[model samples]
Target chain A: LDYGEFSKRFSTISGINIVPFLEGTREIDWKGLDDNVEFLLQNGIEVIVPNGNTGEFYALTIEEAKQVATRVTELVNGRATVVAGIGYSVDTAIELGKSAIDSGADCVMIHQPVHPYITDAGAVEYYRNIIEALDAPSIIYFKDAHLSDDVIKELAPLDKLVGIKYAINDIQRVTQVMRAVPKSSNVAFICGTAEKWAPFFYHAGAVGFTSGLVNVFPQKSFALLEALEEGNQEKIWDVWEDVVPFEDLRAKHNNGNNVVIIKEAMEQLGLRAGVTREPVNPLSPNDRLELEELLKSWNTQE
Target chain B: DYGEFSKRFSTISGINIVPFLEGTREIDWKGLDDNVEFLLQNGIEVIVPNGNTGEFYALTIEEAKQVATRVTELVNGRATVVAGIGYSVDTAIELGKSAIDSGADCVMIHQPVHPYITDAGAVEYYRNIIEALDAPSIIYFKDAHLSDDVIKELAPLDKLVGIKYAINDIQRVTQVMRAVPKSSNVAFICGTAEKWAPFFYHAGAVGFTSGLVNVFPQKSFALLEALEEGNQEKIWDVWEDVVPFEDLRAKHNNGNNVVIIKEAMEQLGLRAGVTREPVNPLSPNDRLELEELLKSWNTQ
Candidate 1:
């Protein structure tokens, strides 16, 4: 689809899927990830994102991320929209973005450069080169406030720019940025913090939002998105209140456990959640038990 | 060996070289050869390969390995080689082993790049890489996230030969120095470049890492000599020429850190190729300022 059509259709519960690894090993479990994707597709999740932070984008080697992008796209078989996340050095990011696009991904979402020394000017140069190179509908994964107001304005003019996943948790800044850029740009503003803060962000101006809960219970993500569409503030808070403890668990330890909670919940649900890689620790005994009880309580609460 | 490592680490004028061909990701072997010889010709005692200044993160393992091996082969015992190694634990260990196996003198651990960092997890990260290496290691604390308590724990590791403290606080250096155990003889090298070398020296760092050394080695060593001799007045005399260039590097959150040095080398008729993305060529105004700065120093 063209940038305009894609931006118009972008307002949905986009599910950022996780990569499952072989239990107790570093190998990617292709069968496991396929099964998980099948489960997501079965539940009416339309947007399938691989290599997201939930998928451990930083942790994957460049080649691995490229391969995952291709495999996930193939698994979806053009049934759902695939937005693969890409990153690293410039050449590498461009290379990965091309791989994803060629492999049938709708577009690639550029991960924020992790190097601590990036500047506003350099950040723009970095994104512009990769996005322009892809020559396809693309999104900026703005997890950092690295862009200046001027830089944000400069980005509005790019022809193929589609949307931005604003991961920062400030409602005022979100609206301020939404207002700063030209509305004619056709870039959909997404509340990237998932369901916990989506109420405030959608109230301000997020058309669509990303979700980890979708990997577990996509039904609720769809429920919230539907409620928001109907402008039912009452049902909006109802679904929002349901996700509190799960997201709160993910937010624990300054979000060190963000992926841990989702994967542990996957394991409890008897799905193909992979083992966490090095430096991304497994859940603690207390949290492990709490997640089990929480999953049970979800059945009890839902 | 660590006693010997510490002694050599003290006052080692190590320089990290840019490894890319001008304006490309390809490794510039001829440029690497010429740069190492230039450093050795200027009496540099230590050569660091695949560092932050070397674009270590931008390089693949194969490229980074070749850079380490070639730098070691080029130095060939003429200078101490401290190769930079980082990424995942497996990657760091593999890179560290490759550098040592290639006959590089030691490995300097790049600070853990994982977004969430805990003191204990960082310690384990360092310990895993350090324990796996046959050669002594240098710990690079680029940020102050690792507590002095963690420093104390790391200071006493059997294979740790030095600490390159990159964070900006002067008191941090003193605190880190105080935190080290007396029995451990790990040398403290300033991780910040020429701008803070003098102050870091005053606080207890014996040597400093420099991208400036890629352009001007005389000033780098001259400032080191003054600090070694406690010639407080001579220190400024040397820094007088070095500070302006280092300030250009220190601009924009040090986003220009690599490019400024690479740009100077280009202007000086040296073989520095352009830096890769995440880094850009200096703007015309920034480039012009450097040219004038070089002329003002009478190095033109």
Candidate 2:
């Protein structure tokens, strides 16, 4: 019914990995999506749909936002739950949500609105209004929050507010929210965090964790999550030590690389999903070195 | 009411300071007079005739020199004039000397547009301008994208009498001031008035520059007075009130920039005429909103 339930259902045998596309969502040919979905399905890797942080969803026009969502849903052929990354200013975000619903996306993942100039109650009103207008199953991204606890609580009870992607790693707040919301209601929490706290987040009431590493090492991710589900804390810790530095490197990148790194990884795996649109720079020689070292280190150990 | 620099330099603090560096014809002396009259009546600081904010890049060297001379004479002595001497080391020297000859009381040097990052080039550029100019110079140094180390290096020049601390980040500005000695003798002035002026002054800025003063001198002058007097509470109150106007002006377009602010002034019964075509006009809604905001705020 919700992400928690979905996570539990898939935990035992959801396949070895979930490969979410980071970028090229706009330009990804529908045929390519179908092929990728077929390839992943054949390879037993369950696909996580559109707007891979690599998709440059932030840079997309609202129209492209819908196109990616629609095309991905059509291509998936009921094979996967299409997770769409919807991005824009507040009103545009709500419109994108409606557009995603029209396009048949199973679940919409909202990225936070970036307002570098002026953020106020007026802006927060825009967020609340956008969330209230969503017509489909939805997840709220906890990236940029100026909302007070009481206000978040008020929004939490809405019918479509099924999952909270608590991207920020404030443990106390996570505990407080989990305590406040009843787990039995199927309201779920998910973490984008990997190895560092995959088990910790599992403990924090998060059901399934999002991992970019699943693109390279789906089995490693599945292994960690399986250990978490089986209550094998020591194995999760052993795997976590290897995962920390890689995740740390990903975090060091400027917010611009949200899609570039994913695309680069995909390209390395011989899936040349070309780089995202401009304003998002291609990975440099230095980033290439760091990424190559990471991939080689991870693969060698395997 | 202007402060004297060396015999070659003079500086004034007034609220109507309009930097007339960007205009068609390059010598709109008559248009310049009409604007000056409007500005002086409103209380403008000395004219910054050719500064970076003025689109000096679009002008030829000869045109810039001629305009500075003409604006200086047009004001005569009612307001002080700082001619913008901006370019490479050789060109900057040439422009600085020309500005001094053209009756500029002070020379405000624009930071170099070096694509490659190098502080040595900038240090030499500062030294060359100070060496070339007979008059005192105010250095315009506020590129957030530049390393703080480079900005600090330019502080010790004797002729670097005034510094236009541009950009809106107060913590960086504080760091810049800290990097330089207290006795550096440069008068640190803020170029970002709305978000930065109060804190800039609080952090020991001497004064600030403003394009908004051309449109609303009374409000800017009052805000400056509040800032200088250390009236923290009133200064913040004014800041909160002026924030919407500042945000509107900032976001109107891609470098729609000063054009929007000027157009907003025109709507509020000021003669701050419309901007040129490449700089687009305000949208109808923006025009209406700006008018309403100015009208409601102007009531006080």
Top model number, lDDT: 1
Model 2: per-residue lDDT, tens digit, A134-179? 7666666664443334434555666666666676677777778777
- Flag regions of model 1 displaced more than 4 Å: A155-159, A169-173, A180-185, A217-220, A234-254, A265-275, A283-302, B19-28, B60-62, B146-156, B170-173, B182-185, B232-244, B284-296
lDDT of 2 at A97: 75
**Taking the tens digit of each residue's C-alpha lDDT, what string does model 1 give over A1-302?**
45777887568877899888776657888898898899899998888889888887766666778889999999999889899888776777788888888988888888777665566677777788888889577788786654464555678778677888888887778888888877789898888889998888888888999999988888888889999989999999999998888999988766767887898898888877966665566787888888888889889875
In Å, residue B25's CA in model 1 sits off its true spot by 6.6
Considering the two chains of model 1, state its CAPRI-style docking category: acceptable
Point out the worst 10-residue segment of candidate 1 chain B by lDDT: B113-122
For candidate 2, the chain B TM-score comes to: 0.84
**What TM-score does chain B of candidate 1 reach?**
0.96
RMSD of each: 3.6, 13.6
Q: For model 1, how does the per-residue alpha-carbon lDDT over B185-209 read when each residue is reduced to its tens digit?
A: 7888888867888898888787888
**In terms of TM-score, which candidate is strongest?**
1
